[PDB]
Amino acid sequence: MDKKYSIGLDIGTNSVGWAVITDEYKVPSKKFKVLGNTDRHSIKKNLIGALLFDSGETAEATRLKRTARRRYTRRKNRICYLQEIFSNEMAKVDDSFFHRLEESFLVEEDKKHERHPIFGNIVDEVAYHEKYPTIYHLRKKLVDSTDKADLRLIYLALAHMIKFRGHFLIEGDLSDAILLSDILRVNTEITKAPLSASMIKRYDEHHQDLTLLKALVRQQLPEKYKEIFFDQSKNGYAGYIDGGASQEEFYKFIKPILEKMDGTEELLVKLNREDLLRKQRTFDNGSIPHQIHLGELHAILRRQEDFYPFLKDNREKIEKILTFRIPYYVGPLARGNSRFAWMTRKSEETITPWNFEEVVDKGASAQSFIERMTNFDKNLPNEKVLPKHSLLYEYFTVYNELTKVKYVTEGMRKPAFLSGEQKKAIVDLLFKTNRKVTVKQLKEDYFKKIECFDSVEISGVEDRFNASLGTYHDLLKIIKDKDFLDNEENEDILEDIVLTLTLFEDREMIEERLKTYAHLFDDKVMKQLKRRRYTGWGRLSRKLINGIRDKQSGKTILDFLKSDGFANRNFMQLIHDDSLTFKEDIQKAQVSGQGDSLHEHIANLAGSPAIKKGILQTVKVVDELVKVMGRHKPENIVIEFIKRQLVETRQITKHVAQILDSRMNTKYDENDKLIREVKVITLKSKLVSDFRKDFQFYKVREINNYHHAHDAYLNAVVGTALIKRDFATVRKVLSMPQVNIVKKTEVQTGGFSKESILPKRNSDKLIARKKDWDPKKYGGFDSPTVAYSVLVVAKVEKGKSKKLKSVKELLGITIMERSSFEKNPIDFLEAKGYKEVKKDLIIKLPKYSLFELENGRKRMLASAGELQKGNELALPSKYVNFLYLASHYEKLKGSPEDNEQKQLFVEQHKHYLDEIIEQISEFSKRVILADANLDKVLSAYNKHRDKPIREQAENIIHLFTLTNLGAPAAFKYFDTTIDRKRYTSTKEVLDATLIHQSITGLYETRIDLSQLGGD
DNA sequence: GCTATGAGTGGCCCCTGTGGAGAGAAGCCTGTCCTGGA
DNA sequence: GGGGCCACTCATAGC
RNA sequence: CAGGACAGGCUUCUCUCCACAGGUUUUAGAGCUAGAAAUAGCAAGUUAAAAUAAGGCUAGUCCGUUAUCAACUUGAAAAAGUGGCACCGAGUCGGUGCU
């Protein structure tokens, strides 16, 4: 028999509940065949469970990293351009200078030339470091002096300016003096480069203050001198300079010291101003306009161009390189092979900063940038939507609000529809002359004045007309020619002008396109038009409203709004009327596009990708549940911190509804109407919560993971209750211990390792940053991420004698080696010293792979060297009820009688606490093996045994954190903190039972490792 | 008897900050309304 | 919040 | 009754592109004096280069952390196919009968 069965669902952010029940609230149980090589051939399981998986991630970080990579690449390209310009003369002075610049990061053993980067000899380097202690001194020297300097110093200064050219927030060239004063604290020192003067002044103040502080400290507190000037570990000056301490840390540490001594008034004031001992490369410099650097560059080039012809002949190139920037409406410069590129090319030469404007069509680039993201019209998927400020759109809005305005005058039996002449007269008299029009204004100015209807009753509008001809008023203010605005032949020209003013944002390109239409207006109008900008887009297309014409009458939807006779069909009525070809045109335009895959259709929805993942997982769960029951289709499907999580929980319902309804019923009747064999019911959680609260089925999110399954089961029960012993059946179902809980196996992806680059050490677990940079000499990354684990059976030459030893262990692959591993596993396994590879025994072990051990103890393979708790705790319902009522003993919100009775029930069964502790201890002994922590918990229990009941319950709820699924977590019990017990040994599972589970946990194949790899 | 290697227990660490431009989606209220059920 | 790493201590095989 | 559409305000979030300021790492910036060395005293400390996921071929001023992923058979892959039912009981499921 096709037993009537229903599928209930509870959809969360990371969990998917599923349940199958009969017509009488019972969950059938089946005997399932079990594959593998073990003895257990058949296992009986209930048709109830739940699924858990990791939260989905937004694509923000990948985009950020991509933008950063592009920043780095473009900066290096600019440096390469500068070296390309300079290299010709460099060979005549010192040909190996650029080699030394590139090869500085290596040790002296790996340097191909002398170790000194700048001059190549120690005397000149010392002289340079003495004469110019900081680069700002060299910059000021080149700006102010008239001396012929060595080209190397010029290159150094120019490269330093180019690599750190500063921001672009300010437009044009350079109350403003106050902004400069905030940027530039220099007062009167007469030079063209104030920034260098400010930095030098800060350096001098730092030097003098350091000398004074050394003097005073050595005078009065000799003992603290060592801490301040030698100890790198503390937040003192040594830490501020040679350590990692920040400025605020240094000020906070130095504040009490200066308070203890005299003569520190000015130093304390400077500390209050954050001006004491301040570096040159700080987080303050973000506010520097790039025009200062441009001016310094220009001054240096102007002063030095009289000695070096190539500097003079290439000054424009250098200024461009400093000032060149790719417009934000162009995008990446790729030849089609990049999925983010939309640039259109005039030719195929290499793009350089000196010829960018000739190769890339900026206008077409902006058009493609704007168009590729705009919505398409739903009714006509082949057309773009008009701008919201378009004239036809405003006319459509005004008339559509006016279309259903019904007017009643004295002597008229029924409300009448406005005539096209009336519509046009009203619009011309009020809307084209007033920005906002109310009902009283209409009554006074059209009915009373024009048609002499002194009293009129107007229905359909209460207060006013929200539509407005704002664009009309703006164009009348600019053009000041009503005849030009009212011309029908200029409607195309006006629409083109509006579209041009809406698409682009640059003044130059807007002028460029509108230059073809300057023949109609003066220069003042063109400039006034130039400054006008509009944003936003509509929801309808031009072709729908005024482009497609009814072949019988030739009218458009615009004409139907203006003049259709007594019918006065509005926008909703015009599309649904069968007398017009427009609805036939709509159905024809419903392109039978290639059926989006369920993945694609889910990916096409609105929300974070995590909710889409949840949708796909729920659909696959439903599909497998249907497959299990003999492919007989079901009757009914009943479906249901940080804010976005619950937002997505409420957002799931509708989409799950239409996707399930679409896939389920695919058969149409003889009239092409869909025969709906499946009923989709959406219910909000409040009804289920009320059902829970009325019948004492409390929900505790801290005990275990059966709450999802119970929520789904109650969802199905309550949903089927309205469309169609019972409480006894529910109570029997809820206390069932065997529930299918499944953890989804995953292959980890992401960054190769952590980002903190650590100093050099003598260890084998450091990762090089390049191909030829041994970490023992240069340090590197740490903590690589495990991709997945493979079981290997082979022989290893061990010991100093290199003796072959047959082995069986786990070797986890890092994400950096996944491609290398799957390219040729034999070569990779030979690389790590394993020989006589047993290819047939390679087993894929992703994260959360499950192993079964004796006494039912289970472990999930968290990584190549760590395990997680896999066994689940099952508690009787009475203990759950007692614990919940105890935890909210004083938080009960209800009638006094029931609250007092529940509190009395809590009072009576205090002996439950010992039973709860004993059962927790037994479960921990049997599956957790946490003897020391268990003893600590037991000792703490007896210690606080006189505490009030509610506090006892609150502390007990914390205990289940030790027994929950996943990685062990620390928890607090009264005043005691319990450390986390971590399993760092994976050897015990090499001879255990390996289990593969279906996505619902019913189909499974068991593999025993004790037989694999045997001699 | 000496040294080296695994094996358990406790402890410390994990890149940050902003500007400019656009497009879209969702939810909450008022007006105007439709499509299905019943 | 959760997995890699290190310092210290300690049992044991090789020798 | 549920869902849906167009306008007028309120809020929150998502997707794409263009820039800037840091931080980290190694090296360079002759430490001295006394002492055989361990070590003790003195002195100085603000800056610079390179890299910032290993790299790849389609060689671009491009791409590299989004999503998808139980097992077996066909398939390069996408993709497709592959596993009995009923009845009684319940500590991670057990028992009874049929096929």
Coordinates of N, CA and C in Angstrom, one line a residue, chain A residues 636-813:
Chain A
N636 N 1.7 15.8 1.5 CA 1.8 17.2 2.0 C 3.3 17.5 2.4
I637 N 3.7 18.7 2.2 CA 5.0 19.2 2.7 C 4.8 20.4 3.6
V638 N 5.1 20.3 4.9 CA 4.9 21.4 5.8 C 6.2 21.9 6.2
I639 N 6.4 23.2 6.0 CA 7.7 23.9 6.2 C 7.5 25.1 7.2
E640 N 8.5 25.5 7.8 CA 8.5 26.7 8.7 C 9.0 27.9 7.9
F641 N 23.0 36.3 19.4 CA 22.8 36.0 18.0 C 23.1 37.2 17.1
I642 N 23.1 37.0 15.8 CA 23.2 38.1 14.8 C 22.0 38.2 14.0
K643 N 21.6 39.4 13.6 CA 20.3 39.6 13.0 C 20.1 38.9 11.7
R644 N 21.2 38.9 10.9 CA 21.0 38.4 9.5 C 20.7 36.9 9.5
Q645 N 21.0 36.2 10.6 CA 20.7 34.8 10.7 C 19.2 34.6 10.7
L646 N 18.5 35.3 11.7 CA 17.0 35.2 11.8 C 16.4 35.8 10.6
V647 N 16.9 36.9 10.0 CA 16.4 37.4 8.7 C 16.3 36.3 7.7
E648 N 17.4 35.6 7.5 CA 17.4 34.5 6.5 C 16.5 33.4 6.9
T649 N 16.3 33.1 8.2 CA 15.3 32.1 8.6 C 13.9 32.5 8.2
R650 N 13.6 33.7 8.3 CA 12.3 34.2 7.8 C 12.2 34.2 6.3
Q651 N 13.4 34.4 5.7 CA 13.5 34.6 4.2 C 13.4 33.2 3.5
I652 N 13.7 32.1 4.2 CA 13.7 30.8 3.6 C 12.4 30.4 3.0
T653 N 11.3 30.8 3.7 CA 10.0 30.1 3.5 C 9.4 30.1 2.1
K654 N 9.3 31.3 1.6 CA 8.7 31.5 0.3 C 9.4 30.7 -0.8
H655 N 10.7 30.9 -0.8 CA 11.5 30.3 -1.9 C 11.5 28.7 -1.8
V656 N 11.6 28.2 -0.6 CA 11.5 26.8 -0.4 C 10.1 26.3 -0.9
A657 N 9.1 27.2 -0.7 CA 7.7 26.8 -1.1 C 7.7 26.7 -2.7
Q658 N 8.1 27.7 -3.4 CA 7.9 27.6 -4.8 C 8.8 26.6 -5.5
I659 N 10.0 26.4 -4.9 CA 10.9 25.4 -5.5 C 10.3 24.0 -5.3
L660 N 9.9 23.7 -4.1 CA 9.3 22.4 -3.9 C 8.0 22.2 -4.8
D661 N 7.2 23.2 -4.8 CA 5.9 23.1 -5.6 C 6.3 23.0 -7.1
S662 N 7.3 23.6 -7.6 CA 7.7 23.5 -9.0 C 8.2 22.1 -9.3
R663 N 9.1 21.6 -8.5 CA 9.7 20.3 -8.8 C 8.7 19.1 -8.6
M664 N 7.9 19.2 -7.6 CA 7.0 18.1 -7.2 C 6.0 17.8 -8.3
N665 N 5.1 18.7 -8.6 CA 4.0 18.5 -9.6 C 4.5 19.0 -11.0
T666 N 4.7 18.0 -11.9 CA 5.1 18.2 -13.2 C 4.1 17.8 -14.3
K667 N 3.0 17.2 -13.8 CA 1.9 16.7 -14.7 C 0.8 17.8 -14.8
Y668 N 0.4 18.1 -16.1 CA -0.6 19.0 -16.4 C -1.9 18.2 -16.8
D669 N -3.1 18.7 -16.5 CA -4.3 18.1 -16.8 C -4.6 18.3 -18.3
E670 N -5.8 17.8 -18.8 CA -6.1 18.0 -20.2 C -6.3 19.4 -20.6
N671 N -6.6 20.3 -19.7 CA -6.7 21.7 -20.0 C -5.4 22.5 -19.7
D672 N -4.3 21.8 -19.6 CA -3.0 22.4 -19.4 C -2.9 23.0 -18.0
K673 N -3.8 22.7 -17.1 CA -3.7 23.2 -15.7 C -2.9 22.1 -14.9
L674 N -2.0 22.6 -14.0 CA -1.2 21.7 -13.3 C -2.0 21.0 -12.2
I675 N -1.9 19.7 -12.2 CA -2.6 18.8 -11.2 C -1.7 18.8 -10.0
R676 N -2.1 19.5 -8.9 CA -1.3 19.7 -7.8 C -1.4 18.5 -6.8
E677 N -0.5 17.6 -7.0 CA -0.6 16.4 -6.1 C 0.1 16.6 -4.8
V678 N 0.8 17.7 -4.6 CA 1.5 18.0 -3.4 C 1.0 19.4 -2.8
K679 N 0.7 19.4 -1.5 CA 0.3 20.6 -0.8 C 1.4 21.2 0.0
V680 N 1.7 22.5 -0.2 CA 2.7 23.2 0.5 C 2.1 24.1 1.5
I681 N 2.4 23.9 2.7 CA 1.8 24.7 3.8 C 3.0 25.4 4.6
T682 N 2.8 26.8 4.7 CA 3.8 27.6 5.4 C 3.2 28.0 6.8
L683 N 3.9 27.7 7.8 CA 3.5 28.1 9.2 C 4.7 28.8 9.9
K684 N 4.3 29.8 10.7 CA 5.2 30.6 11.5 C 5.4 29.9 12.9
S685 N 6.6 30.1 13.4 CA 7.0 29.3 14.6 C 6.2 29.6 15.8
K686 N 5.4 30.7 15.8 CA 4.7 31.1 17.0 C 3.6 30.0 17.4
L687 N 3.0 29.5 16.4 CA 2.0 28.4 16.7 C 2.6 27.2 17.3
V688 N 3.7 26.8 16.8 CA 4.5 25.6 17.3 C 4.9 25.9 18.7
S689 N 5.4 27.1 19.0 CA 5.9 27.5 20.3 C 4.7 27.5 21.3
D690 N 3.5 27.9 20.9 CA 2.3 27.9 21.7 C 2.0 26.4 22.0
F691 N 2.0 25.6 21.0 CA 1.7 24.1 21.2 C 2.7 23.5 22.2
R692 N 4.0 23.9 22.1 CA 5.0 23.5 23.0 C 4.7 23.9 24.4
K693 N 4.4 25.2 24.6 CA 4.2 25.8 25.9 C 2.9 25.3 26.6
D694 N 1.9 25.0 25.8 CA 0.6 24.5 26.4 C 0.7 23.1 26.9
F695 N 1.6 22.3 26.3 CA 1.7 20.9 26.6 C 3.1 20.5 27.2
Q696 N 3.8 21.4 27.7 CA 5.0 21.2 28.6 C 6.1 20.5 27.8
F697 N 6.1 20.6 26.4 CA 7.2 20.1 25.6 C 8.3 21.2 25.4
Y698 N 9.0 21.5 26.5 CA 10.0 22.5 26.5 C 11.1 22.2 25.6
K699 N 11.8 23.3 25.1 CA 12.9 23.1 24.2 C 14.2 23.7 24.8
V700 N 15.2 22.8 25.0 CA 16.4 23.2 25.6 C 17.5 23.1 24.5
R701 N 18.1 24.2 24.1 CA 19.0 24.2 23.1 C 20.4 23.8 23.5
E702 N 20.6 23.4 24.8 CA 21.9 23.2 25.4 C 22.2 21.7 25.6
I703 N 21.1 20.8 25.6 CA 21.3 19.4 25.9 C 22.0 18.7 24.7
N704 N 21.3 18.7 23.6 CA 21.8 17.9 22.4 C 21.2 18.4 21.2
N705 N 21.4 17.7 20.0 CA 20.9 18.2 18.7 C 19.6 17.5 18.3
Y706 N 18.8 17.0 19.2 CA 17.5 16.4 18.8 C 16.4 17.5 18.7
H707 N 16.7 18.7 19.1 CA 15.7 19.7 19.1 C 15.3 20.1 17.7
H708 N 16.2 20.1 16.7 CA 15.8 20.3 15.3 C 14.8 19.2 14.8
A709 N 15.1 17.9 15.1 CA 14.2 16.9 14.7 C 12.8 17.0 15.4
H710 N 12.8 17.3 16.7 CA 11.6 17.4 17.4 C 10.8 18.6 16.9
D711 N 11.5 19.7 16.6 CA 10.8 20.9 16.0 C 10.2 20.5 14.7
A712 N 10.9 19.8 13.8 CA 10.3 19.4 12.5 C 9.1 18.5 12.7
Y713 N 9.2 17.5 13.6 CA 8.2 16.6 13.8 C 6.9 17.3 14.3
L714 N 7.1 18.2 15.3 CA 5.9 19.0 15.7 C 5.4 19.9 14.6
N715 N 6.3 20.5 13.8 CA 5.8 21.2 12.6 C 4.9 20.4 11.8
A716 N 5.3 19.2 11.4 CA 4.5 18.3 10.6 C 3.2 18.0 11.3
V717 N 3.2 17.6 12.6 CA 2.0 17.2 13.3 C 1.0 18.4 13.3
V718 N 1.5 19.6 13.7 CA 0.6 20.7 13.9 C 0.0 21.2 12.5
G719 N 0.9 21.1 11.5 CA 0.4 21.5 10.1 C -0.6 20.6 9.6
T720 N -0.4 19.2 9.8 CA -1.4 18.3 9.3 C -2.7 18.3 10.2
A721 N -2.6 18.8 11.4 CA -3.7 18.8 12.3 C -4.9 19.6 11.8
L722 N -4.5 20.8 11.3 CA -5.6 21.7 10.8 C -6.2 21.3 9.5
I723 N -5.4 20.8 8.6 CA -5.9 20.4 7.3 C -6.8 19.2 7.4
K724 N -6.5 18.3 8.3 CA -7.3 17.1 8.5 C -8.6 17.4 9.3
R725 N -4.0 9.8 23.7 CA -3.6 9.0 22.5 C -2.6 9.8 21.6
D726 N -3.1 10.8 21.0 CA -2.2 11.7 20.2 C -1.1 12.3 21.0
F727 N -1.4 12.8 22.2 CA -0.3 13.3 23.1 C 0.5 12.2 23.6
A728 N -0.1 11.0 23.8 CA 0.7 9.9 24.2 C 1.7 9.5 23.1
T729 N 1.2 9.5 21.9 CA 2.0 9.1 20.7 C 3.2 10.1 20.6
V730 N 2.9 11.4 20.8 CA 4.0 12.4 20.7 C 5.0 12.2 21.8
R731 N 4.5 11.9 23.0 CA 5.5 11.7 24.1 C 6.3 10.4 23.9
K732 N 5.7 9.4 23.3 CA 6.5 8.2 22.9 C 7.5 8.5 21.9
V733 N 7.2 9.3 20.9 CA 8.1 9.6 19.8 C 9.3 10.5 20.3
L734 N 9.0 11.5 21.2 CA 10.0 12.4 21.6 C 11.1 11.7 22.5
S735 N 10.8 10.7 23.3 CA 11.7 10.1 24.1 C 12.5 8.9 23.4
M736 N 12.4 8.8 22.1 CA 13.1 7.8 21.4 C 14.6 8.1 21.3
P737 N 15.4 7.1 21.7 CA 16.9 7.4 21.8 C 17.5 7.4 20.4
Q738 N 17.1 6.5 19.5 CA 17.7 6.3 18.2 C 17.3 7.4 17.3
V739 N 18.1 8.4 17.0 CA 17.9 9.5 16.1 C 19.1 9.6 15.2
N740 N 18.8 9.7 13.9 CA 19.9 9.8 12.9 C 20.5 11.2 12.8
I741 N 21.7 11.4 13.5 CA 22.4 12.6 13.4 C 23.6 12.5 12.5
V742 N 23.7 13.4 11.6 CA 24.8 13.2 10.5 C 25.6 14.5 10.5
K743 N 26.9 14.4 10.3 CA 27.7 15.6 10.1 C 28.3 15.5 8.7
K744 N 28.1 16.6 8.0 CA 28.4 16.6 6.6 C 29.9 16.7 6.3
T745 N 30.4 15.7 5.6 CA 31.8 15.7 5.2 C 32.1 16.8 4.3
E746 N 33.2 17.5 4.4 CA 33.6 18.7 3.7 C 35.1 18.6 3.3
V747 N 35.4 19.3 2.2 CA 36.8 19.5 1.8 C 37.2 20.9 2.1
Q748 N 38.1 21.2 3.1 CA 38.4 22.5 3.5 C 39.1 23.3 2.4
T749 N 38.7 24.6 2.2 CA 39.3 25.5 1.3 C 39.6 26.8 2.0
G750 N 40.4 27.6 1.3 CA 40.8 28.9 1.8 C 42.2 29.3 1.8
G751 N 42.7 30.1 2.7 CA 44.1 30.4 2.7 C 45.0 29.2 3.0
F752 N 46.3 29.3 2.5 CA 47.2 28.2 2.8 C 47.6 28.0 4.2
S753 N 47.7 29.2 4.9 CA 48.2 29.2 6.3 C 47.8 30.5 6.9
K754 N 48.2 30.7 8.2 CA 48.0 32.0 8.8 C 48.9 33.0 8.2
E755 N 48.5 34.3 8.5 CA 49.1 35.4 7.8 C 50.3 36.1 8.6
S756 N 50.4 35.8 9.8 CA 51.5 36.3 10.6 C 52.8 35.7 10.3
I757 N 53.7 36.4 9.6 CA 55.0 36.0 9.2 C 55.9 36.0 10.5
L758 N 56.4 34.8 10.9 CA 57.1 34.6 12.1 C 58.6 34.7 11.9
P759 N 59.4 35.1 12.9 CA 60.8 35.2 12.7 C 61.5 33.8 12.5
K760 N 62.7 33.8 12.1 CA 63.4 32.5 11.8 C 63.6 31.7 13.0
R761 N 63.5 30.4 12.9 CA 63.7 29.4 13.9 C 64.3 28.1 13.3
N762 N 64.8 27.3 14.2 CA 65.3 26.0 13.8 C 64.3 24.9 14.0
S763 N 63.4 24.7 13.0 CA 62.3 23.7 13.0 C 62.0 23.3 11.6
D764 N 61.4 22.2 11.5 CA 61.0 21.6 10.2 C 59.5 22.0 9.8
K765 N 58.8 22.7 10.6 CA 57.4 23.0 10.4 C 57.2 24.5 9.9
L766 N 58.2 25.1 9.3 CA 58.0 26.4 8.7 C 57.9 26.3 7.2
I767 N 57.1 27.2 6.6 CA 56.8 27.2 5.2 C 57.5 28.4 4.6
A768 N 58.2 28.1 3.5 CA 58.9 29.2 2.7 C 57.9 30.1 2.1
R769 N 58.3 31.4 1.9 CA 57.4 32.4 1.2 C 57.7 32.4 -0.3
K770 N 58.8 31.8 -0.7 CA 59.2 31.7 -2.1 C 59.9 30.3 -2.4
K771 N 60.4 30.2 -3.6 CA 61.0 28.9 -4.0 C 62.3 28.7 -3.4
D772 N 63.1 29.8 -3.3 CA 64.5 29.7 -2.9 C 64.8 30.3 -1.5
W773 N 63.8 30.4 -0.6 CA 64.0 31.1 0.7 C 63.7 30.1 1.8
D774 N 64.8 29.4 2.2 CA 64.7 28.4 3.3 C 64.3 29.1 4.5
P775 N 63.3 28.7 5.2 CA 62.8 29.3 6.4 C 63.8 29.4 7.5
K776 N 64.8 28.5 7.6 CA 65.9 28.5 8.6 C 66.7 29.8 8.4
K777 N 66.7 30.4 7.3 CA 67.4 31.7 7.0 C 66.5 32.9 7.0
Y778 N 65.2 32.8 6.7 CA 64.4 33.9 6.4 C 63.0 33.8 7.1
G779 N 62.8 32.8 7.9 CA 61.4 32.6 8.4 C 60.4 32.4 7.4
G780 N 59.1 32.4 7.8 CA 58.0 32.2 6.9 C 56.7 31.9 7.6
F781 N 55.8 31.4 6.9 CA 54.4 31.1 7.4 C 54.4 30.0 8.5
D782 N 53.3 29.8 9.1 CA 53.1 28.8 10.1 C 51.6 28.3 10.0
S783 N 51.4 27.1 10.6 CA 50.1 26.5 10.7 C 49.4 26.3 9.4
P784 N 49.8 25.4 8.5 CA 49.1 25.1 7.3 C 47.8 24.5 7.6
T785 N 46.8 24.6 6.6 CA 45.5 24.1 6.8 C 45.4 22.7 6.1
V786 N 44.8 21.7 6.8 CA 44.7 20.4 6.2 C 43.6 20.4 5.2
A787 N 43.9 19.8 4.0 CA 42.9 19.7 2.9 C 42.0 18.4 3.2
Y788 N 42.7 17.3 3.3 CA 42.0 16.0 3.7 C 43.1 15.0 4.0
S789 N 42.6 13.9 4.6 CA 43.5 12.9 5.0 C 43.4 11.6 4.2
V790 N 44.5 10.9 4.0 CA 44.6 9.7 3.2 C 45.3 8.6 4.1
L791 N 44.8 7.4 4.0 CA 45.4 6.3 4.7 C 46.4 5.6 3.8
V792 N 47.6 5.4 4.3 CA 48.7 4.9 3.5 C 49.3 3.7 4.2
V793 N 49.5 2.6 3.4 CA 50.1 1.4 3.9 C 51.3 1.2 3.0
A794 N 52.5 1.2 3.6 CA 53.8 1.2 2.8 C 54.9 0.8 3.8
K795 N 56.1 0.9 3.3 CA 57.3 0.6 4.1 C 58.2 1.9 4.2
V796 N 58.7 2.1 5.4 CA 59.5 3.3 5.7 C 60.9 2.9 6.2
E797 N 61.9 3.4 5.6 CA 63.3 3.2 6.1 C 63.5 4.1 7.4
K798 N 63.5 3.5 8.6 CA 63.6 4.2 9.8 C 64.9 4.0 10.5
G799 N 65.3 4.9 11.4 CA 66.5 4.7 12.2 C 67.7 5.3 11.4
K800 N 68.8 5.3 12.1 CA 70.0 5.8 11.4 C 70.6 4.7 10.4
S801 N 70.2 3.5 10.6 CA 70.6 2.4 9.7 C 69.6 2.3 8.4
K802 N 68.6 3.1 8.4 CA 67.6 3.1 7.3 C 67.0 1.7 7.1
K803 N 66.3 1.2 8.1 CA 65.8 -0.2 8.0 C 64.3 -0.1 7.5
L804 N 64.0 -0.9 6.5 CA 62.6 -0.9 6.0 C 61.6 -1.4 7.0
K805 N 60.5 -0.7 7.2 CA 59.5 -1.0 8.2 C 58.1 -0.8 7.6
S806 N 57.3 -1.9 7.5 CA 56.0 -1.7 7.1 C 55.1 -0.9 8.1
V807 N 54.4 0.1 7.6 CA 53.8 1.1 8.4 C 52.3 1.2 8.0
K808 N 51.5 1.9 8.9 CA 50.1 2.2 8.6 C 49.8 3.4 9.5
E809 N 49.7 4.6 8.8 CA 49.4 5.8 9.5 C 48.7 6.8 8.6
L810 N 48.4 7.9 9.2 CA 47.7 9.0 8.5 C 48.6 10.1 8.1
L811 N 48.6 10.5 6.8 CA 49.3 11.6 6.3 C 48.4 12.6 5.7
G812 N 48.2 13.8 6.3 CA 47.3 14.8 5.9 C 47.9 15.7 4.8
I813 N 47.2 16.0 3.8 CA 47.6 16.9 2.7 C 47.3 18.3 3.0

